């Protein structure tokens, strides 16, 4: 049968980038032509494979990761990138084989007064390994003194909200991202 790419791209709600979702796609025939033959993608960057010739090379496994990030953070969803998202939320390996797909979701995910449900990790003691997922809400110590799970001063809660509002500039608007790994 056919692969469930509609379940991923057309989902009513996307995950926060710190808790990015991963759907393992197995035992199906993928119709990749329709995906690229869509003008509604503002980012469609493939690495190691050509988007037109997606069904001509070897298939390790097919993973579909999805989340929502800021507009000016889309440039971090790529190999070798640094920044808050690539270091502390979602990291692509240097030898990445797949495609990064993103589109503006301002009319879906931003609310008047702020949609605070979408979060990202702002602090961490070390960068994430490729494809590592971190959902811990332990208090982060930025100073010399311990915190003992208490929030204050140089002790920060590690997660921050985007608070998407539709009147934000495009750099702060929500973007839905789908990473296809092969």
């Amino acid at each position, epitope marked *: 049968n056919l692969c469930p790419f509609g379940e991923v791209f057309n989902a009513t709600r996307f995950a926060s980038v710190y808790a990015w979702n991963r759907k393992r796609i197995s035992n199906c025939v993928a119709d990749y032509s329709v995906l690229y033959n869509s003008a509604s993608f503002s980012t469609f960057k493939c690495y190691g494979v050509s988007p037109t010739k997606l069904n001509d090379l070897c298939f390790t496994n097919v993973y579909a990761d999805s989340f929502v990030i800021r507009g000016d953070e889309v440039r971090q969803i790529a190999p070798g990138q640094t920044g808050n998202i690539a270091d502390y939320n979602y990291k692509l390996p240097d030898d990445f084989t797949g495609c990064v797909i993103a589109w503006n979701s301002n009319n879906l995910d931003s609310k008047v007064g702020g949609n605070y449900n979408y979060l990202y990790r702002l602090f961490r003691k070390s960068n994430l390994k490729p494809f590592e997922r971190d959902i811990s809400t332990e208090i982060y110590q930025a100073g010399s003194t311990p915190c003992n799970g208490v929030k204050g001063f140089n002790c920060y809660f590690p997660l921050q909200s985007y608070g998407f509002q539709p*009147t934000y500039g495009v750099g702060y608007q929500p973007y839905r991202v789908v990473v296809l790994s092969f």
Partner: antibody
Amino acid sequence: QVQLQESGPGLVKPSETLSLTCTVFGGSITSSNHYWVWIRQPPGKGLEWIGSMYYSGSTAYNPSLTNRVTISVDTSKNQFSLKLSSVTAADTAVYYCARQIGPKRPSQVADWFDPWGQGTLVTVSS
Amino acid sequence: DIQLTQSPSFLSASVGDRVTITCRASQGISSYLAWYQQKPGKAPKLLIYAASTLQSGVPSRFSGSGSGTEFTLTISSLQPEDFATYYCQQLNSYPLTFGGGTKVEIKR
């Protein structure tokens, strides 16, 4: 200079539905940095915020008005409207439409109202 | 819900007097405050936003100041046309809320 011209019936029977419309002049309603709002003022009382709306659909309503408030936008006519259902005498007020400036950045000072419609008195009575 | 308490409810000052109106928020909202002037039968008119930024087209005798919980609107020289009810508004949190208003009468 943006102008707002509201219209609608000033008399609504109890349990019926109030309905008012605001027409934007000197500027398009598909503004990417403004909300379109409604504010009411009971006679001799203060101001109460009703709701705000982005042209593409998203709304924010006052939880004090339960689920009887609907705002809508007609981009093709440069209008936005207010519908308040199951009205009582406690809904008799001068209703204003206004333009609210939205923030462009997280934690930016915005959300003030300028300009305003002239105000329409709606009396709830049979 | 952020509640704004405006003091006094009424005041009566002479032309040329210096008038001061207070708006106290139930919590600290930094500088997320605006001031409005409403004359009889008219819609409210924006005077100050961001606590102290004067709106383009407002006389310089109007001024706002304050931060945190207490804010003040000052009319340095009261004029006869300044007869109005002045409202503060918090612009930080939803739902958006106004103060109760201060009605300013002219003494003559």
